[PDB]
């Protein structure tokens, strides 16, 4: 027993090599601004510990997104601030415009750049073979950047990908679950949306790294090119691994758990059983043939792997023939 240790293949000691101020977010001092400088316009939605609004900066009339941080620990507030500030000026990463507190309730809020988003449910239906490779390369620039900066996003999903299609502009948002990578640290597996959770989260292997975001991206890719959102549609965390297993096959799931000496949660051992690998070509039909190519299926196969150490890194993902000629490099 005892899980086998794992280290990130890239950007391993990146935080160990920067001063405390960089990654020791609890000790970071926040200079809170005023929310009274912002006029809220309409409610955009909510998170686990957040309420989101589209607002206006009174002084310059610019549209802005205001995320009120509902009862959370100030530890997590400071972590999101620190990640956003470290990643500012990064490609396809949302810009943190201000850090504020309400004058009356004193509740903290983060102010972001506004993106004129089209809901993925109406947008993906409209995307071309080129569009998908373009947007996928843009998500990867954002992921290679934050991974190179020592941060795991940990919640890569269509709702966290703001796309202004008309302007062909993409922003990776909600760095509210993002964490700093530290070699040999065991992270909380109760992160990400059910559908995009990596098998490491599902099997409860805590010593995961940057490669988690790579699995979620592969999930986003599958829903697009096959026109099936979400691609892996479990009704719970146990049924999620069952859906994955029915596609990737159990041979590799068991080789994975055996390799890292993962003690599966016992409820798994009653529902997992044995499944043969389903080839990606099985998901290819008449309606999505225009989005599919041998290189799309190869790229996808290299991301959707159980073994986190076997998935492509964001740099390798960008070097793939899937993106040849899509961008300059």
Ligand X SMILES: CC(=O)Nc1cc(Nc2cc(Nc3cn(C)cn3)n3ncc(C#N)c3n2)ccc1C
> Which residues define the annotated binding site?
44-52, 67
Residues 6+ apart with CB under 8 A from 252: 277, 305, 306, 307
CB atoms within 10 A of CB 227: 15
User: Is omega for the bond preceding 286 within 30 degrees of 0, making it cis?
Assistant: no
Q: How far is the CB of 123 from ligand X (least distance, A)?
A: 11
Distance CA 273, CA 276 (A): 11
Contact between 188 and Cl ion by CB under 5 A: the answer reads: yes
Nearer to Cl ion, 188 or 289 (CB): 188
Tell me, yes or no, if 164 is annotated catalytic. no
Instruction: Give the distance, in angstroms, between the CA of residue 302 and the centroid of all CA atoms in the same chain.
Output: 17
* Closest residue by Cα to residue 155 from 45, 73, 47: 47
Q: How far is the CB of 26 from Cl ion (least distance, A)?
A: 13
Nearer to Cl ion, 64 or 156 (CB): 156
**Residues forming the site for ligand X (CB under 6 A):** 44-45, 47, 50, 52, 54, 65, 67, 94, 112, 114-117, 162, 173-174, 176
DSSP state of 262: -
| Position with the least CB separation from Cl ion | 188
**Which positions make up the binding site for ATP?**
44-52, 67
Which of the following is catalytic: 131, 144, 155, 174? 155
DSSP state of 230: S
Distance CA 80, CA 85 (A): 9
Q: How far is the CB of 117 from ligand X (least distance, A)?
A: 4
Nearer to ligand X, 44 or 247 (CB): 44
Which of the listed partners (ligand X, Cl ion, none) does 188 bind, with a CB threshold of 5 to 8 Å by partner kind? Cl ion
Distance CA 244, CA 272 (A): 10
Contact between 185 and Cl ion by CB under 5 A: the answer reads: no
Q: How far is the CB of 272 from ligand X (least distance, A)?
A: 33
Phi, psi of 299 (to 5 degrees): -50, -50
Nearer to ligand X, 67 or 141 (CB): 67
Residues 6+ apart with CB under 8 A from 70: 49, 50, 51, 107
Sign, CA dihedral 132-134-138-141, equals positive
Distance CA 271, CA 267 (A): 7
Which of the listed partners (ligand X, Cl ion, none) does 185 bind, with a CB threshold of 5 to 8 Å by partner kind? none
Nearer to ligand X, 52 or 100 (CB): 52
Q: How far is the CB of 42 from ligand X (least distance, A)?
A: 9
Just list the catalytic residues: 155
Residues that bind Cl ion (CB under 5 A): 188
């Amino acid at each position: 027993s005892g899980p086998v240790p794992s280290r990130a293949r890239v950007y391993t000691d990146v935080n160990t090599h920067r001063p405390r101020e960089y990654w020791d977010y609890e000790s970071h001092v926040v200079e809170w601004g005023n929310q009274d400088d912002y006029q809220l316009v309409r409610k955009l939605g909510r998170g686990k510990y957040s309420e989101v609004f589209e607002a206006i900066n009174i002084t310059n009339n610019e549209k802005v997104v205001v995320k009120i941080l509902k009862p959370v620990k100030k530890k997590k507030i400071k972590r999101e601030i620190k990640i956003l500030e470290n990643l500012r000026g990064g490609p396809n990463i949302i810009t943190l415009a201000d850090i504020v507190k309400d004058p009356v309730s004193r509740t903290p809020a983060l102010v972001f750049e506004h993106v004129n988003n089209t809901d993925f449910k109406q947008l993906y239906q409209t995307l071309t073979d080129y569009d998908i490779r373009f947007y996928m390369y843009e998500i990867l620039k954002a992921l290679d950047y934050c991974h190179s900066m020592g941060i795991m996003h940990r919640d890569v999903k269509p709702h966290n990908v703001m796309i202004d299609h008309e302007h062909r502009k993409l922003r990776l948002i909600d760095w509210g679950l993002a964490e700093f990578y530290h070699p040999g640290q065991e992270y909380n597996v109760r992160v990400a949306s059910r559908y995009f959770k990596g098998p490491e989260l599902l099997v409860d292997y805590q010593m995961y790294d940057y490669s988690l975001d790579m699995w979620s991206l592969g999930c986003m890719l599958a829903s697009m090119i096959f026109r099936k959102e979400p691609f892996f549609h479990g009704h719970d965390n146990y049924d999620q691994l069952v859906r994955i297993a029915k596609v990737l096959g159990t041979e590799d799931l068991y080789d994975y758990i055996d390799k890292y000496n993962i003690e599966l949660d016992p409820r798994f051992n009653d529902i997992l059983g044995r499944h043969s690998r389903k080839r990606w070509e099985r998901f290819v039909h008449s309606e999505n043939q225009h989005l599919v190519s041998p290189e799309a299926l190869d790229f996808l196969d290299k991301l959707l792997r159980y073994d986190h150490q076997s998935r492509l890194t964001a740099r390798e993902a960008m070097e793939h023939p899937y993106f040849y000629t899509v961008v300059k490099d």
